């Protein structure tokens, strides 16, 4: 209990951006998986989850419960949040555009089957016209290697993680965006991220039929 213990089920879900921030920061974590609905209710009843939900992360003696509260703490603790407030204002504006798009991709497996391909067509229109041009534009304006202060931050890890999810959606979207392609390569070869991308890591896979089935059972949605 010096190693962060991330409480969640065995899936990408809402824990994955934390798994990537901690691993890129070189921190080693421990995971306690929720296998059943009763695993989640025990957690609730013991007073571990402030709003009855997970992600939950035991770190520095706190039972931290919200995604954005978990990430903001880790990003500050490990110097991945910029040097001053004008610098983390640019990081929050970029990474919140990334969480808007990321929420669309995250929830797409739960979409009503009629809607599913209309939603997917809308997510590809947003990537082409709105989100990727915006980020191509900040990398093109300063011509530096990193999104914000010519120093690695959480905006780069949160953006590259998303570029991996968009590549699984359709590997053709990124092709007209050369500076994003370059940033993906670059952050993917950093030793901490490279370790994480390798075959034995705590990194999780796409949601399939059986994970979504387990997710509906545990979280009763």
Ligand X SMILES: N[C@@H](CCC(=O)N[C@@H](CSCc1ccccc1)C(=O)NCC(=O)O)C(=O)O
Annotated binding site for glutathione: 8, 44, 53-54, 66-67
219 near ligand X, judged by CB under 6 A: yes
Binding to a second copy by CB under 8 A, coded x per residue (else -) over 12-51, reads --------------------------------------xx
Collapsed DSSP state (helix, strand, coil) of residue 150: coil
Q: Which residues contact 85 (CB under 8 A, 6 or more apart)?
A: none
Collapsed DSSP state (helix, strand, coil) of residue 219: coil
CB closer to a second copy out of 38 and 100: 100
Tell me how far, at minimum, the Cβ of 59 lies from ligand X, in Å: 14
Binding to a second copy by CB under 8 A, coded x per residue (else -) over 110-149, reads --------------------xx--x---------------
Q: Which stretch binds ligand X (CB under 6 A): 47-55, 112-120, 153-161, 196-204?
A: 47-55
The count of residues in the chain is 221
Interface of this chain with ligand X, residues 67 to 86, rule: CB under 6 A: 67
Tell me how far, at minimum, the Cβ of 71 lies from a second copy, in Å: 9
List Cβ<8 Å contacts ≥24 apart for 176-185: 177/132, 177/133, 177/135, 177/136, 178/136, 179/136, 179/139, 179/140, 180/132, 180/135, 180/136, 180/139, 182/139, 183/139, 183/145, 183/147, 183/156, 183/159, 184/160
Number of residues that bind ligand X (CB under 6 A): 13
Interface of this chain with ligand X, residues 50 to 69, rule: CB under 6 A: 52-55, 66-67
Diameter over CA atoms, the chain: 52
Start-to-end Cα distance in the chain? 32
The neighbour count for residue 84, using CB atoms within 10 Å, is 8
4 near ligand X, judged by CB under 6 A: no
CB closer to a second copy out of 180 and 193: 180
Tell me how far, at minimum, the Cβ of 208 lies from a second copy, in Å: 27
Which stretches of the chain bind ligand X, using CB under 6 A?
A: 13-14, 52-55, 66-67, 96, 100, 106, 215, 219
């Amino acid at each position: 209990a010096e190693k962060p213990k991330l409480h969640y089920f065995n899936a990408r879900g809402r824990m994955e951006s934390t798994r990537w921030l901690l691993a890129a920061a070189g921190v080693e974590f421990e995971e306690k998986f929720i296998k059943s609905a009763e695993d989640l209710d025990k957690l609730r009843n013991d007073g571990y989850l402030m709003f009855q939900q997970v992600p939950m992360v035991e770190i520095d003696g706190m039972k931290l419960v919200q995604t954005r509260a978990i990430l903001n703490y880790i990003a500050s603790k490990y110097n991945l949040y910029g040097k001053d407030i004008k610098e983390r204002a640019l990081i929050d504006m970029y990474i919140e555009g990334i969480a808007d798009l990321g929420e669309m991709i995250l929830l797409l497996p739960v979409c009503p089957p009629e809607e599913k391909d209309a939603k997917l067509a809308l997510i590809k229109e947003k990537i082409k016209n709105r989100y990727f041009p915006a980020f191509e534009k900040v990398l093109k304006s300063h011509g530096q290697d990193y999104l914000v202060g010519n120093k690695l931050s959480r905006a780069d890890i949160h953006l590259v993680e998303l570029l991996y999810y968009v590549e699984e959606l359709d590997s053709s979207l990124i092709s007209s965006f050369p500076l994003l392609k370059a940033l993906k390569t670059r952050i993917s070869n950093l030793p901490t991220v490279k370790k994480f991308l390798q075959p034995g890591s705590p990194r999780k896979p796409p949601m399939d039929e059986k994970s979504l089935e387990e997710a509906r059972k545990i979280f009763r949605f």
